[PDB]
């Protein structure tokens, strides 16, 4: 059924699964109009689908042109998300199709289930976790590719860079969510932390800096301080 802290390690077993986050598919800026009214302007977005065991991110870019002449875009975005994920599964060879698909927001269960009627053997599940995946557009390389795109586009990334060479999926995912929780609670500081030292670089084929093991522990520590902090500055404790 639902996914929560009890059944947390299921993600790293050898059943293929994908997380799907739809938070950034429909993105607007809200402005005033010459007559003094308000209007939105859509910007490009994306569907964030992730295999938590491999790190593979399938990043489907949603070009504003999708929305042209559409009504009820918030509700349409969820159906368009389900159509893109269904198309993604249908493209993959059978041994590569997920056995589960875990949506980060319950509103996506019905729109996805209807799109995957052809896959009665793929389980569509919700989750009780407060996962930070909306912060994924706070990763510069990801935001860049999304904002520059001029047409629909699928771009593939390993959100773990080469971490799996040295650590396990369970720890790599814990690292990624700590980094995404920090970026979400205070983007400026979180970034300051990651880049303070110019000697540490981001390889062109990676998203995150090339830290050693000991640097990552120092990094992870500071990200926990931040999240505790912002919690005080937000709850006065």
């Amino acid at each position: 059924g639902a996914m929560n802290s009890s059944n947390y390690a299921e993600l790293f077993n050898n059943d293929i699964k994908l997380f799907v986050d739809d938070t950034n598919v429909y993105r607007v800026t809200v402005h005033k109009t010459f007559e003094g009214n308000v209007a939105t302007k859509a910007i490009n977005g994306c569907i964030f689908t992730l295999n938590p065991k491999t790190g593979h991110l399938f990043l489907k870019i949603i070009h504003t042109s999708v929305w042209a002449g559409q009504k009820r875009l918030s509700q349409l975005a969820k159906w368009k998300t389900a159509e893109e994920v269904s198309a993604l599964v249908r493209s993959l060879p059978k041994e590569e199709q997920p056995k589960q698909i875990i949506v980060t927001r319950k509103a996506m269960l019905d729109p996805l289930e209807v799109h995957m009627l052809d896959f009665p053997n793929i389980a569509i599940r919700p989750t009780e976790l407060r996962l930070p995946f909306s912060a994924a557009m706070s990763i510069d390389k990801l935001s860049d590719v999304v904002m520059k795109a001029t047409e629909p586009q699928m771009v593939l990334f390993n959100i773990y860079d080469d971490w799996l060479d040295r650590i396990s999926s369970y720890t790599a995912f814990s690292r990624l969510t700590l980094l995404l929780r920090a970026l979400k609670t205070n983007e400026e500081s979180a970034k300051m932390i990651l880049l303070s030292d110019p000697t540490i670089t981001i390889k062109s084929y990676h998203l995150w800096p090339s830290f050693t093991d000991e640097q990552w522990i120092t990094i992870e520590s500071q990200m926990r301080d931040l999240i505790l902090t912002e919690y005080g500055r937000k709850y006065n404790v």
Partner: protein
């Protein structure tokens, strides 16, 4: 006017005839029911005093033969049977009518309740779902399950209601996923109306049938089916105007007749607040919404 004679009443039972019911005491001299209006289906049903578990019942139409009731002490129930010997039947009935051992189906002449509850209920059509074809009448009880209930375990004793499923390939055209799920006009009209029932009278019949089994027997799957068929219409942007108006009337009498103390279990909040306030047909069920709000405002 027609007659259902009983052989005897060996056990204490509450007996129902359509929307009427009366108490018969163990070995009270009772020999059945008279003056049954011809021209409608009818249902006769039973709740033993000794075990309020198991409401059970027979659907029957007097034009289709001569039918009596006879307690079976092996199997423990009032059984419906057909008398094929015509002159033996007439003679039995006359003798019991003469001795006045029968209760009169008490229809008030202003009252169209039964017809309004049964307009499109047909005996050859009920037999397409309560399969028991050696008999002209059809047995239902509280605990019988539906074909779709067994898909989620005895098929001969099932209620093969038409299968409705909103997240199904039958209900969802490929490439109109969102259009078809949010607006079920194509499921309702092409798949169900044109494809299955053939017409709305048939669709309304099954729905009327669904409700009465639910109300009379507390058959849980029957009430899932009534609610489903309601929901499919309420959730379709494009419904013939004649269908919507007839539905408003049908639901209006169903609501009016429901016992005031059985509503909590027999009415589904989600379906009704959708039908009446969110769905496409929020504006179109004027009679049913007035009676729902004055009688069961609690549900809303």
């Amino acid at each position: 006017m027609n007659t259902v004679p009983f052989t005897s009443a060996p056990i204490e039972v509450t007996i129902g005839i359509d929307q009427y019911s009366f108490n018969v005491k163990e070995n009270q001299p009772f020999h059945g029911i008279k003056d049954i209006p011809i021209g409608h289906v009818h249902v006769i049903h039973f709740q033993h005093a000794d075990n309020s578990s198991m409401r059970y019942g027979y659907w029957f139409d007097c034009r289709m033969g001569n039918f009596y009731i006879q307690y079976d002490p092996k199997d423990g129930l009032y059984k419906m049977m057909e008398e094929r010997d015509g002159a033996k039947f007439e003679n039995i009935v006359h003798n019991f009518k003469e001795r006045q051992m029968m209760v009169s189906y008490p229809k008030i002449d202003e009252d169209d309740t039964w017809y309004n509850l049964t307009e499109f209920v047909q005996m050859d059509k009920i037999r397409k779902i309560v399969r028991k074809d050696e008999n002209q009448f059809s047995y239902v009880d509280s605990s019988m399950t539906t074909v779709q209930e067994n898909e989620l375990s005895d098929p001969a004793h099932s209620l093969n209601y038409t299968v409705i499923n909103f997240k199904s390939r039958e209900a969802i055209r490929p490439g109109h996923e969102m259009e078809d799920f949010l607006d079920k006009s194509y499921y309702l009209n092409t798949v169900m109306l044109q494809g299955i029932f053939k017409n709305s009278s048939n669709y309304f019949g099954e729905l009327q049938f669904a409700f009465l089994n639910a109300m009379f027997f507390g058959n849980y799957g029957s009430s899932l089916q009534w609610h489903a068929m309601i929901e499919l219409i309420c959730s379709s942007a494009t419904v013939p105007k004649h269908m919507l108006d007839k539905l408003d009337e049908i639901l209006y009498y169903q609501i009016k007749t429901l016992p005031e103390q059985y509503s909590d279990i027999l009415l589904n909040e989600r379906v009704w607040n959708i039908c009446l306030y969110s769905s496409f047909q929020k504006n179109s069920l004027h009679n049913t919404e007035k009676i729902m709000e004055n009688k069961y405002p609690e549900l809303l």
